[PDB]
PDB file of all heavy atoms in Angstrom:
ATOM      1  N   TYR B  23      -4.739  22.738 -31.496  1.00 44.42           N
ATOM      2  CA  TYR B  23      -3.958  23.779 -32.139  1.00 44.42           C
ATOM      3  C   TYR B  23      -2.677  24.023 -31.358  1.00 44.42           C
ATOM      4  O   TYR B  23      -2.673  23.995 -30.124  1.00 44.42           O
ATOM      5  CB  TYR B  23      -4.770  25.065 -32.260  1.00 44.42           C
ATOM      6  CG  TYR B  23      -5.797  25.012 -33.361  1.00 44.42           C
ATOM      7  CD1 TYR B  23      -6.759  25.996 -33.492  1.00 44.42           C
ATOM      8  CD2 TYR B  23      -5.799  23.976 -34.275  1.00 44.42           C
ATOM      9  CE1 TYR B  23      -7.693  25.942 -34.496  1.00 44.42           C
ATOM     10  CE2 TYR B  23      -6.728  23.916 -35.278  1.00 44.42           C
ATOM     11  CZ  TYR B  23      -7.669  24.900 -35.388  1.00 44.42           C
ATOM     12  OH  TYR B  23      -8.589  24.832 -36.402  1.00 44.42           O
ATOM     13  N   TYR B  24      -1.592  24.264 -32.087  1.00 40.50           N
ATOM     14  CA  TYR B  24      -0.265  24.323 -31.493  1.00 40.50           C
ATOM     15  C   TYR B  24      -0.093  25.550 -30.608  1.00 40.50           C
ATOM     16  O   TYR B  24      -0.545  26.644 -30.940  1.00 40.50           O
ATOM     17  CB  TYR B  24       0.792  24.330 -32.596  1.00 40.50           C
ATOM     18  CG  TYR B  24       2.203  24.559 -32.117  1.00 40.50           C
ATOM     19  CD1 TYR B  24       3.059  23.499 -31.890  1.00 40.50           C
ATOM     20  CD2 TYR B  24       2.688  25.838 -31.918  1.00 40.50           C
ATOM     21  CE1 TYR B  24       4.345  23.709 -31.460  1.00 40.50           C
ATOM     22  CE2 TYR B  24       3.966  26.053 -31.483  1.00 40.50           C
ATOM     23  CZ  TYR B  24       4.791  24.989 -31.258  1.00 40.50           C
ATOM     24  OH  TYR B  24       6.073  25.211 -30.827  1.00 40.50           O
ATOM     25  N   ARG B  27      -2.059  29.094 -29.562  1.00 40.08           N
ATOM     26  CA  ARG B  27      -3.244  29.086 -30.403  1.00 40.08           C
ATOM     27  C   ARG B  27      -4.311  28.230 -29.871  1.00 40.08           C
ATOM     28  O   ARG B  27      -5.299  28.045 -30.560  1.00 40.08           O
ATOM     29  CB  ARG B  27      -2.879  28.632 -31.809  1.00 40.08           C
ATOM     30  CG  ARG B  27      -1.984  29.588 -32.531  1.00 40.08           C
ATOM     31  CD  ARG B  27      -1.353  28.928 -33.716  1.00 40.08           C
ATOM     32  NE  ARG B  27      -2.358  28.381 -34.611  1.00 40.08           N
ATOM     33  CZ  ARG B  27      -2.764  28.975 -35.721  1.00 40.08           C
ATOM     34  NH1 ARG B  27      -2.259  30.133 -36.107  1.00 40.08           N
ATOM     35  NH2 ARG B  27      -3.692  28.387 -36.467  1.00 40.08           N
ATOM     36  N   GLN B  36      -8.587  34.387 -33.754  1.00 33.23           N
ATOM     37  CA  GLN B  36      -8.095  34.557 -35.109  1.00 33.23           C
ATOM     38  C   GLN B  36      -7.882  33.214 -35.783  1.00 33.23           C
ATOM     39  O   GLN B  36      -8.176  33.053 -36.973  1.00 33.23           O
ATOM     40  CB  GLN B  36      -6.803  35.360 -35.084  1.00 33.23           C
ATOM     41  CG  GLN B  36      -6.804  36.439 -34.041  1.00 33.23           C
ATOM     42  CD  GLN B  36      -5.699  37.436 -34.246  1.00 33.23           C
ATOM     43  OE1 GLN B  36      -5.596  38.419 -33.519  1.00 33.23           O
ATOM     44  NE2 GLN B  36      -4.864  37.195 -35.246  1.00 33.23           N
ATOM     45  N   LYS B  40      -9.806  32.117 -39.268  1.00 31.76           N
ATOM     46  CA  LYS B  40      -9.073  31.608 -40.419  1.00 31.76           C
ATOM     47  C   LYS B  40      -9.588  30.240 -40.818  1.00 31.76           C
ATOM     48  O   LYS B  40      -9.960  30.025 -41.973  1.00 31.76           O
ATOM     49  CB  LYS B  40      -7.585  31.520 -40.120  1.00 31.76           C
ATOM     50  CG  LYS B  40      -6.868  32.819 -39.912  1.00 31.76           C
ATOM     51  CD  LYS B  40      -5.457  32.503 -39.426  1.00 31.76           C
ATOM     52  CE  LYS B  40      -4.655  33.743 -39.086  1.00 31.76           C
ATOM     53  NZ  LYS B  40      -5.220  34.500 -37.928  1.00 31.76           N
ATOM     54  N   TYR B  44     -10.796  28.967 -44.498  1.00 34.88           N
ATOM     55  CA  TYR B  44     -10.143  27.924 -45.278  1.00 34.88           C
ATOM     56  C   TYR B  44     -11.112  26.800 -45.596  1.00 34.88           C
ATOM     57  O   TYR B  44     -11.083  26.244 -46.696  1.00 34.88           O
ATOM     58  CB  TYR B  44      -8.918  27.379 -44.543  1.00 34.88           C
ATOM     59  CG  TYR B  44      -7.765  28.346 -44.418  1.00 34.88           C
ATOM     60  CD1 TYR B  44      -7.557  29.042 -43.247  1.00 34.88           C
ATOM     61  CD2 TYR B  44      -6.875  28.545 -45.461  1.00 34.88           C
ATOM     62  CE1 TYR B  44      -6.518  29.925 -43.117  1.00 34.88           C
ATOM     63  CE2 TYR B  44      -5.825  29.422 -45.340  1.00 34.88           C
ATOM     64  CZ  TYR B  44      -5.653  30.109 -44.165  1.00 34.88           C
ATOM     65  OH  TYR B  44      -4.613  30.991 -44.028  1.00 34.88           O
ATOM     66  N   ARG B  47     -13.393  27.889 -48.405  1.00 34.59           N
ATOM     67  CA  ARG B  47     -12.706  27.878 -49.688  1.00 34.59           C
ATOM     68  C   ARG B  47     -12.470  26.457 -50.175  1.00 34.59           C
ATOM     69  O   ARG B  47     -12.588  26.179 -51.372  1.00 34.59           O
ATOM     70  CB  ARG B  47     -11.385  28.629 -49.586  1.00 34.59           C
ATOM     71  CG  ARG B  47     -10.624  28.688 -50.889  1.00 34.59           C
ATOM     72  CD  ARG B  47      -9.140  28.817 -50.651  1.00 34.59           C
ATOM     73  NE  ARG B  47      -8.700  27.897 -49.611  1.00 34.59           N
ATOM     74  CZ  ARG B  47      -7.470  27.415 -49.502  1.00 34.59           C
ATOM     75  NH1 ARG B  47      -6.529  27.718 -50.379  1.00 34.59           N
ATOM     76  NH2 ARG B  47      -7.181  26.600 -48.494  1.00 34.59           N
ATOM     77  N   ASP B  48     -12.133  25.545 -49.265  1.00 32.94           N
ATOM     78  CA  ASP B  48     -11.752  24.197 -49.667  1.00 32.94           C
ATOM     79  C   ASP B  48     -12.947  23.379 -50.120  1.00 32.94           C
ATOM     80  O   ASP B  48     -12.786  22.428 -50.895  1.00 32.94           O
ATOM     81  CB  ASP B  48     -11.039  23.491 -48.518  1.00 32.94           C
ATOM     82  CG  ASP B  48      -9.575  23.881 -48.407  1.00 32.94           C
ATOM     83  OD1 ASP B  48      -8.911  24.002 -49.459  1.00 32.94           O
ATOM     84  OD2 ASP B  48      -9.087  24.061 -47.271  1.00 32.94           O
ATOM     85  N   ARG B  52     -12.345  20.721 -53.249  1.00 38.91           N
ATOM     86  CA  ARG B  52     -12.500  19.275 -53.166  1.00 38.91           C
ATOM     87  C   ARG B  52     -13.113  18.707 -54.434  1.00 38.91           C
ATOM     88  O   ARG B  52     -12.738  17.621 -54.884  1.00 38.91           O
ATOM     89  CB  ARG B  52     -13.350  18.916 -51.954  1.00 38.91           C
ATOM     90  CG  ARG B  52     -13.768  17.477 -51.909  1.00 38.91           C
ATOM     91  CD  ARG B  52     -14.250  17.108 -50.532  1.00 38.91           C
ATOM     92  NE  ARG B  52     -15.362  17.939 -50.098  1.00 38.91           N
ATOM     93  CZ  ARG B  52     -15.779  18.026 -48.844  1.00 38.91           C
ATOM     94  NH1 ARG B  52     -15.181  17.367 -47.869  1.00 38.91           N
ATOM     95  NH2 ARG B  52     -16.821  18.798 -48.561  1.00 38.91           N
ATOM     96  N   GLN B  55     -10.079  18.387 -57.173  1.00 43.21           N
ATOM     97  CA  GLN B  55      -9.014  17.411 -57.002  1.00 43.21           C
ATOM     98  C   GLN B  55      -9.468  16.025 -57.416  1.00 43.21           C
ATOM     99  O   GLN B  55      -8.709  15.275 -58.040  1.00 43.21           O
ATOM    100  CB  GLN B  55      -8.548  17.408 -55.552  1.00 43.21           C
ATOM    101  CG  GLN B  55      -8.316  18.790 -55.000  1.00 43.21           C
ATOM    102  CD  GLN B  55      -7.508  18.780 -53.726  1.00 43.21           C
ATOM    103  OE1 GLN B  55      -7.183  17.725 -53.192  1.00 43.21           O
ATOM    104  NE2 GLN B  55      -7.172  19.964 -53.232  1.00 43.21           N
TER     105      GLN B  55
ATOM    106  P     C F  32      -0.527  30.111 -20.407  1.00 84.78           P
ATOM    107  OP1   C F  32       0.414  30.463 -21.486  1.00 84.78           O
ATOM    108  OP2   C F  32      -1.295  28.857 -20.501  1.00 84.78           O
ATOM    109  O5'   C F  32       0.278  30.078 -19.041  1.00 84.78           O
ATOM    110  C5'   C F  32       1.292  31.032 -18.769  1.00 84.78           C
ATOM    111  C4'   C F  32       1.940  30.765 -17.441  1.00 84.78           C
ATOM    112  O4'   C F  32       0.951  30.884 -16.395  1.00 84.78           O
ATOM    113  C3'   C F  32       2.503  29.372 -17.259  1.00 84.78           C
ATOM    114  O3'   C F  32       3.791  29.234 -17.822  1.00 84.78           O
ATOM    115  C2'   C F  32       2.487  29.202 -15.751  1.00 84.78           C
ATOM    116  O2'   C F  32       3.594  29.871 -15.173  1.00 84.78           O
ATOM    117  C1'   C F  32       1.225  29.967 -15.367  1.00 84.78           C
ATOM    118  N1    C F  32       0.046  29.094 -15.188  1.00 84.78           N
ATOM    119  C2    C F  32      -0.141  28.435 -13.976  1.00 84.78           C
ATOM    120  O2    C F  32       0.698  28.580 -13.089  1.00 84.78           O
ATOM    121  N3    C F  32      -1.218  27.651 -13.796  1.00 84.78           N
ATOM    122  C4    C F  32      -2.098  27.523 -14.777  1.00 84.78           C
ATOM    123  N4    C F  32      -3.151  26.743 -14.562  1.00 84.78           N
ATOM    124  C5    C F  32      -1.945  28.187 -16.017  1.00 84.78           C
ATOM    125  C6    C F  32      -0.871  28.959 -16.177  1.00 84.78           C
ATOM    126  P     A F  48      -1.682  29.562 -41.364  1.00 64.48           P
ATOM    127  OP1   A F  48      -1.562  29.319 -42.816  1.00 64.48           O
ATOM    128  OP2   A F  48      -3.003  29.793 -40.752  1.00 64.48           O
ATOM    129  O5'   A F  48      -1.032  28.329 -40.602  1.00 64.48           O
ATOM    130  C5'   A F  48      -1.242  28.117 -39.210  1.00 64.48           C
ATOM    131  C4'   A F  48      -0.775  26.742 -38.806  1.00 64.48           C
ATOM    132  O4'   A F  48       0.576  26.546 -39.297  1.00 64.48           O
ATOM    133  C3'   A F  48      -0.730  26.463 -37.305  1.00 64.48           C
ATOM    134  O3'   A F  48      -1.054  25.094 -37.067  1.00 64.48           O
ATOM    135  C2'   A F  48       0.734  26.692 -36.968  1.00 64.48           C
ATOM    136  O2'   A F  48       1.179  25.999 -35.825  1.00 64.48           O
ATOM    137  C1'   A F  48       1.421  26.186 -38.229  1.00 64.48           C
ATOM    138  N9    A F  48       2.752  26.750 -38.480  1.00 64.48           N
ATOM    139  C8    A F  48       3.750  26.116 -39.166  1.00 64.48           C
ATOM    140  N7    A F  48       4.854  26.797 -39.275  1.00 64.48           N
ATOM    141  C5    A F  48       4.567  27.973 -38.617  1.00 64.48           C
ATOM    142  C6    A F  48       5.338  29.113 -38.381  1.00 64.48           C
ATOM    143  N6    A F  48       6.590  29.248 -38.803  1.00 64.48           N
ATOM    144  N1    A F  48       4.785  30.128 -37.701  1.00 64.48           N
ATOM    145  C2    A F  48       3.533  29.993 -37.281  1.00 64.48           C
ATOM    146  N3    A F  48       2.710  28.969 -37.439  1.00 64.48           N
ATOM    147  C4    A F  48       3.282  27.970 -38.126  1.00 64.48           C
ATOM    148  P     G F  49      -2.048  24.692 -35.874  1.00 63.36           P
ATOM    149  OP1   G F  49      -1.800  25.592 -34.734  1.00 63.36           O
ATOM    150  OP2   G F  49      -1.957  23.233 -35.676  1.00 63.36           O
ATOM    151  O5'   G F  49      -3.492  25.024 -36.445  1.00 63.36           O
ATOM    152  C5'   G F  49      -4.091  24.205 -37.437  1.00 63.36           C
ATOM    153  C4'   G F  49      -4.805  25.024 -38.482  1.00 63.36           C
ATOM    154  O4'   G F  49      -3.830  25.645 -39.351  1.00 63.36           O
ATOM    155  C3'   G F  49      -5.705  24.248 -39.427  1.00 63.36           C
ATOM    156  O3'   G F  49      -6.996  24.042 -38.884  1.00 63.36           O
ATOM    157  C2'   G F  49      -5.722  25.120 -40.671  1.00 63.36           C
ATOM    158  O2'   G F  49      -6.621  26.198 -40.497  1.00 63.36           O
ATOM    159  C1'   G F  49      -4.312  25.690 -40.670  1.00 63.36           C
ATOM    160  N9    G F  49      -3.376  24.945 -41.524  1.00 63.36           N
ATOM    161  C8    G F  49      -2.341  24.189 -41.066  1.00 63.36           C
ATOM    162  N7    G F  49      -1.638  23.661 -42.017  1.00 63.36           N
ATOM    163  C5    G F  49      -2.242  24.103 -43.173  1.00 63.36           C
ATOM    164  C6    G F  49      -1.910  23.848 -44.519  1.00 63.36           C
ATOM    165  O6    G F  49      -0.995  23.156 -44.958  1.00 63.36           O
ATOM    166  N1    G F  49      -2.764  24.480 -45.397  1.00 63.36           N
ATOM    167  C2    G F  49      -3.811  25.263 -45.018  1.00 63.36           C
ATOM    168  N2    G F  49      -4.534  25.799 -46.007  1.00 63.36           N
ATOM    169  N3    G F  49      -4.126  25.515 -43.761  1.00 63.36           N
ATOM    170  C4    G F  49      -3.307  24.908 -42.892  1.00 63.36           C
ATOM    171  P     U F  50      -7.693  22.599 -38.942  1.00 61.18           P
ATOM    172  OP1   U F  50      -8.771  22.573 -37.931  1.00 61.18           O
ATOM    173  OP2   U F  50      -6.635  21.566 -38.926  1.00 61.18           O
ATOM    174  O5'   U F  50      -8.365  22.552 -40.378  1.00 61.18           O
ATOM    175  C5'   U F  50      -9.307  23.532 -40.777  1.00 61.18           C
ATOM    176  C4'   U F  50      -9.364  23.643 -42.277  1.00 61.18           C
ATOM    177  O4'   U F  50      -8.088  24.111 -42.772  1.00 61.18           O
ATOM    178  C3'   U F  50      -9.594  22.341 -43.023  1.00 61.18           C
ATOM    179  O3'   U F  50     -10.959  21.980 -43.086  1.00 61.18           O
ATOM    180  C2'   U F  50      -8.971  22.615 -44.383  1.00 61.18           C
ATOM    181  O2'   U F  50      -9.849  23.371 -45.194  1.00 61.18           O
ATOM    182  C1'   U F  50      -7.790  23.499 -44.006  1.00 61.18           C
ATOM    183  N1    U F  50      -6.543  22.723 -43.847  1.00 61.18           N
ATOM    184  C2    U F  50      -5.828  22.373 -44.967  1.00 61.18           C
ATOM    185  O2    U F  50      -6.165  22.659 -46.094  1.00 61.18           O
ATOM    186  N3    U F  50      -4.691  21.665 -44.728  1.00 61.18           N
ATOM    187  C4    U F  50      -4.205  21.280 -43.509  1.00 61.18           C
ATOM    188  O4    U F  50      -3.163  20.643 -43.456  1.00 61.18           O
ATOM    189  C5    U F  50      -4.990  21.679 -42.396  1.00 61.18           C
ATOM    190  C6    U F  50      -6.105  22.368 -42.602  1.00 61.18           C
ATOM    191  P     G F  51     -11.385  20.439 -43.033  1.00 61.66           P
ATOM    192  OP1   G F  51     -12.850  20.380 -42.869  1.00 61.66           O
ATOM    193  OP2   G F  51     -10.519  19.750 -42.054  1.00 61.66           O
ATOM    194  O5'   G F  51     -11.035  19.900 -44.485  1.00 61.66           O
ATOM    195  C5'   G F  51     -11.618  20.495 -45.629  1.00 61.66           C
ATOM    196  C4'   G F  51     -11.121  19.863 -46.903  1.00 61.66           C
ATOM    197  O4'   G F  51      -9.836  20.418 -47.276  1.00 61.66           O
ATOM    198  C3'   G F  51     -10.866  18.372 -46.869  1.00 61.66           C
ATOM    199  O3'   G F  51     -12.049  17.605 -46.945  1.00 61.66           O
ATOM    200  C2'   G F  51      -9.928  18.177 -48.052  1.00 61.66           C
ATOM    201  O2'   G F  51     -10.649  18.183 -49.269  1.00 61.66           O
ATOM    202  C1'   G F  51      -9.091  19.454 -47.988  1.00 61.66           C
ATOM    203  N9    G F  51      -7.806  19.227 -47.306  1.00 61.66           N
ATOM    204  C8    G F  51      -7.469  19.559 -46.024  1.00 61.66           C
ATOM    205  N7    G F  51      -6.253  19.219 -45.713  1.00 61.66           N
ATOM    206  C5    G F  51      -5.763  18.618 -46.855  1.00 61.66           C
ATOM    207  C6    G F  51      -4.501  18.048 -47.123  1.00 61.66           C
ATOM    208  O6    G F  51      -3.527  17.952 -46.379  1.00 61.66           O
ATOM    209  N1    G F  51      -4.415  17.550 -48.408  1.00 61.66           N
ATOM    210  C2    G F  51      -5.417  17.600 -49.322  1.00 61.66           C
ATOM    211  N2    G F  51      -5.146  17.063 -50.511  1.00 61.66           N
ATOM    212  N3    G F  51      -6.601  18.126 -49.089  1.00 61.66           N
ATOM    213  C4    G F  51      -6.703  18.617 -47.845  1.00 61.66           C
ATOM    214  P     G F  52     -12.023  16.053 -46.545  1.00 61.10           P
ATOM    215  OP1   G F  52     -13.418  15.586 -46.449  1.00 61.10           O
ATOM    216  OP2   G F  52     -11.132  15.873 -45.380  1.00 61.10           O
ATOM    217  O5'   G F  52     -11.356  15.362 -47.809  1.00 61.10           O
ATOM    218  C5'   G F  52     -10.811  14.059 -47.720  1.00 61.10           C
ATOM    219  C4'   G F  52      -9.721  13.839 -48.737  1.00 61.10           C
ATOM    220  O4'   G F  52      -8.728  14.889 -48.629  1.00 61.10           O
ATOM    221  C3'   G F  52      -8.924  12.561 -48.561  1.00 61.10           C
ATOM    222  O3'   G F  52      -9.569  11.431 -49.107  1.00 61.10           O
ATOM    223  C2'   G F  52      -7.604  12.895 -49.232  1.00 61.10           C
ATOM    224  O2'   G F  52      -7.730  12.822 -50.641  1.00 61.10           O
ATOM    225  C1'   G F  52      -7.439  14.360 -48.849  1.00 61.10           C
ATOM    226  N9    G F  52      -6.643  14.544 -47.621  1.00 61.10           N
ATOM    227  C8    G F  52      -7.064  15.204 -46.501  1.00 61.10           C
ATOM    228  N7    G F  52      -6.175  15.248 -45.559  1.00 61.10           N
ATOM    229  C5    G F  52      -5.095  14.580 -46.089  1.00 61.10           C
ATOM    230  C6    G F  52      -3.840  14.313 -45.515  1.00 61.10           C
ATOM    231  O6    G F  52      -3.439  14.633 -44.397  1.00 61.10           O
ATOM    232  N1    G F  52      -3.013  13.613 -46.373  1.00 61.10           N
ATOM    233  C2    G F  52      -3.360  13.216 -47.630  1.00 61.10           C
ATOM    234  N2    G F  52      -2.439  12.542 -48.323  1.00 61.10           N
ATOM    235  N3    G F  52      -4.536  13.457 -48.175  1.00 61.10           N
ATOM    236  C4    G F  52      -5.354  14.142 -47.358  1.00 61.10           C
ATOM    237  P     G F  75       2.422  18.602 -52.805  1.00 74.67           P
ATOM    238  OP1   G F  75       3.200  18.993 -53.999  1.00 74.67           O
ATOM    239  OP2   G F  75       2.768  19.147 -51.479  1.00 74.67           O
ATOM    240  O5'   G F  75       0.897  18.958 -53.079  1.00 74.67           O
ATOM    241  C5'   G F  75       0.365  18.937 -54.395  1.00 74.67           C
ATOM    242  C4'   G F  75      -1.001  19.572 -54.450  1.00 74.67           C
ATOM    243  O4'   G F  75      -1.867  18.942 -53.477  1.00 74.67           O
ATOM    244  C3'   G F  75      -1.068  21.046 -54.098  1.00 74.67           C
ATOM    245  O3'   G F  75      -0.728  21.880 -55.188  1.00 74.67           O
ATOM    246  C2'   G F  75      -2.508  21.216 -53.645  1.00 74.67           C
ATOM    247  O2'   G F  75      -3.367  21.310 -54.767  1.00 74.67           O
ATOM    248  C1'   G F  75      -2.774  19.883 -52.961  1.00 74.67           C
ATOM    249  N9    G F  75      -2.600  19.951 -51.506  1.00 74.67           N
ATOM    250  C8    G F  75      -1.590  19.400 -50.781  1.00 74.67           C
ATOM    251  N7    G F  75      -1.711  19.610 -49.505  1.00 74.67           N
ATOM    252  C5    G F  75      -2.872  20.342 -49.386  1.00 74.67           C
ATOM    253  C6    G F  75      -3.513  20.863 -48.242  1.00 74.67           C
ATOM    254  O6    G F  75      -3.180  20.787 -47.059  1.00 74.67           O
ATOM    255  N1    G F  75      -4.668  21.543 -48.566  1.00 74.67           N
ATOM    256  C2    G F  75      -5.142  21.693 -49.833  1.00 74.67           C
ATOM    257  N2    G F  75      -6.276  22.387 -49.940  1.00 74.67           N
ATOM    258  N3    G F  75      -4.556  21.215 -50.910  1.00 74.67           N
ATOM    259  C4    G F  75      -3.435  20.551 -50.612  1.00 74.67           C
ATOM    260  P     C F  76      -0.079  23.322 -54.929  1.00 71.66           P
ATOM    261  OP1   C F  76       0.103  23.973 -56.242  1.00 71.66           O
ATOM    262  OP2   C F  76       1.080  23.148 -54.032  1.00 71.66           O
ATOM    263  O5'   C F  76      -1.190  24.115 -54.112  1.00 71.66           O
ATOM    264  C5'   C F  76      -2.374  24.581 -54.739  1.00 71.66           C
ATOM    265  C4'   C F  76      -3.283  25.271 -53.756  1.00 71.66           C
ATOM    266  O4'   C F  76      -3.650  24.351 -52.703  1.00 71.66           O
ATOM    267  C3'   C F  76      -2.680  26.449 -53.016  1.00 71.66           C
ATOM    268  O3'   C F  76      -2.697  27.642 -53.770  1.00 71.66           O
ATOM    269  C2'   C F  76      -3.530  26.521 -51.760  1.00 71.66           C
ATOM    270  O2'   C F  76      -4.767  27.151 -52.036  1.00 71.66           O
ATOM    271  C1'   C F  76      -3.798  25.047 -51.486  1.00 71.66           C
ATOM    272  N1    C F  76      -2.860  24.474 -50.503  1.00 71.66           N
ATOM    273  C2    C F  76      -3.089  24.643 -49.142  1.00 71.66           C
ATOM    274  O2    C F  76      -4.074  25.285 -48.773  1.00 71.66           O
ATOM    275  N3    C F  76      -2.234  24.103 -48.255  1.00 71.66           N
ATOM    276  C4    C F  76      -1.190  23.418 -48.688  1.00 71.66           C
ATOM    277  N4    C F  76      -0.364  22.899 -47.786  1.00 71.66           N
ATOM    278  C5    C F  76      -0.931  23.231 -50.067  1.00 71.66           C
ATOM    279  C6    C F  76      -1.785  23.767 -50.931  1.00 71.66           C
ATOM    280  P     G F  77      -1.537  28.728 -53.573  1.00 69.81           P
ATOM    281  OP1   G F  77      -1.838  29.885 -54.436  1.00 69.81           O
ATOM    282  OP2   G F  77      -0.240  28.038 -53.721  1.00 69.81           O
ATOM    283  O5'   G F  77      -1.696  29.198 -52.063  1.00 69.81           O
ATOM    284  C5'   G F  77      -2.723  30.101 -51.692  1.00 69.81           C
ATOM    285  C4'   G F  77      -2.903  30.159 -50.198  1.00 69.81           C
ATOM    286  O4'   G F  77      -2.933  28.819 -49.655  1.00 69.81           O
ATOM    287  C3'   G F  77      -1.804  30.844 -49.410  1.00 69.81           C
ATOM    288  O3'   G F  77      -1.922  32.254 -49.421  1.00 69.81           O
ATOM    289  C2'   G F  77      -1.969  30.239 -48.027  1.00 69.81           C
ATOM    290  O2'   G F  77      -3.059  30.837 -47.351  1.00 69.81           O
ATOM    291  C1'   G F  77      -2.359  28.808 -48.370  1.00 69.81           C
ATOM    292  N9    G F  77      -1.195  27.912 -48.390  1.00 69.81           N
ATOM    293  C8    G F  77      -0.510  27.483 -49.489  1.00 69.81           C
ATOM    294  N7    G F  77       0.482  26.697 -49.199  1.00 69.81           N
ATOM    295  C5    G F  77       0.439  26.604 -47.823  1.00 69.81           C
ATOM    296  C6    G F  77       1.260  25.892 -46.933  1.00 69.81           C
ATOM    297  O6    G F  77       2.223  25.174 -47.192  1.00 69.81           O
ATOM    298  N1    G F  77       0.873  26.070 -45.621  1.00 69.81           N
ATOM    299  C2    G F  77      -0.168  26.844 -45.221  1.00 69.81           C
ATOM    300  N2    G F  77      -0.391  26.897 -43.907  1.00 69.81           N
ATOM    301  N3    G F  77      -0.943  27.513 -46.038  1.00 69.81           N
ATOM    302  C4    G F  77      -0.586  27.344 -47.313  1.00 69.81           C
ATOM    303  P     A F  79      -2.321  36.255 -44.721  1.00 68.00           P
ATOM    304  OP1   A F  79      -3.296  35.383 -45.402  1.00 68.00           O
ATOM    305  OP2   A F  79      -2.107  37.622 -45.222  1.00 68.00           O
ATOM    306  O5'   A F  79      -2.732  36.323 -43.186  1.00 68.00           O
ATOM    307  C5'   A F  79      -1.844  36.830 -42.202  1.00 68.00           C
ATOM    308  C4'   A F  79      -2.421  36.687 -40.815  1.00 68.00           C
ATOM    309  O4'   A F  79      -1.365  36.751 -39.831  1.00 68.00           O
ATOM    310  C3'   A F  79      -3.389  37.768 -40.376  1.00 68.00           C
ATOM    311  O3'   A F  79      -4.695  37.585 -40.885  1.00 68.00           O
ATOM    312  C2'   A F  79      -3.319  37.681 -38.856  1.00 68.00           C
ATOM    313  O2'   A F  79      -4.131  36.629 -38.374  1.00 68.00           O
ATOM    314  C1'   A F  79      -1.863  37.296 -38.630  1.00 68.00           C
ATOM    315  N9    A F  79      -1.034  38.440 -38.222  1.00 68.00           N
ATOM    316  C8    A F  79       0.019  39.007 -38.875  1.00 68.00           C
ATOM    317  N7    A F  79       0.550  40.014 -38.240  1.00 68.00           N
ATOM    318  C5    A F  79      -0.198  40.110 -37.089  1.00 68.00           C
ATOM    319  C6    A F  79      -0.136  40.972 -35.994  1.00 68.00           C
ATOM    320  N6    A F  79       0.755  41.947 -35.877  1.00 68.00           N
ATOM    321  N1    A F  79      -1.021  40.815 -35.000  1.00 68.00           N
ATOM    322  C2    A F  79      -1.911  39.836 -35.124  1.00 68.00           C
ATOM    323  N3    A F  79      -2.071  38.959 -36.103  1.00 68.00           N
ATOM    324  C4    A F  79      -1.172  39.152 -37.066  1.00 68.00           C
ATOM    325  P     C F  80      -5.604  38.853 -41.243  1.00 67.73           P
ATOM    326  OP1   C F  80      -6.877  38.332 -41.760  1.00 67.73           O
ATOM    327  OP2   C F  80      -4.815  39.781 -42.073  1.00 67.73           O
ATOM    328  O5'   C F  80      -5.901  39.541 -39.842  1.00 67.73           O
ATOM    329  C5'   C F  80      -6.961  39.076 -39.026  1.00 67.73           C
ATOM    330  C4'   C F  80      -7.106  39.885 -37.762  1.00 67.73           C
ATOM    331  O4'   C F  80      -5.862  39.860 -37.019  1.00 67.73           O
ATOM    332  C3'   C F  80      -7.393  41.364 -37.930  1.00 67.73           C
ATOM    333  O3'   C F  80      -8.749  41.649 -38.202  1.00 67.73           O
ATOM    334  C2'   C F  80      -6.913  41.935 -36.610  1.00 67.73           C
ATOM    335  O2'   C F  80      -7.843  41.644 -35.582  1.00 67.73           O
ATOM    336  C1'   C F  80      -5.665  41.096 -36.372  1.00 67.73           C
ATOM    337  N1    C F  80      -4.461  41.732 -36.948  1.00 67.73           N
ATOM    338  C2    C F  80      -3.866  42.798 -36.290  1.00 67.73           C
ATOM    339  O2    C F  80      -4.356  43.195 -35.232  1.00 67.73           O
ATOM    340  N3    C F  80      -2.775  43.380 -36.813  1.00 67.73           N
ATOM    341  C4    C F  80      -2.274  42.931 -37.951  1.00 67.73           C
ATOM    342  N4    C F  80      -1.195  43.529 -38.435  1.00 67.73           N
ATOM    343  C5    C F  80      -2.849  41.847 -38.649  1.00 67.73           C
ATOM    344  C6    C F  80      -3.929  41.285 -38.114  1.00 67.73           C
TER     345        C F  80
END
Side-chain angles (χ1 to χ4, degrees):
Chain B
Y23 284 170
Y24 173 97
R27 294 164 56 100
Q36 323 195 176
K40 293 172 184 65
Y44 292 100
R47 181 207 45 154
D48 279 319
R52 170 164 58 195
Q55 313 196 355

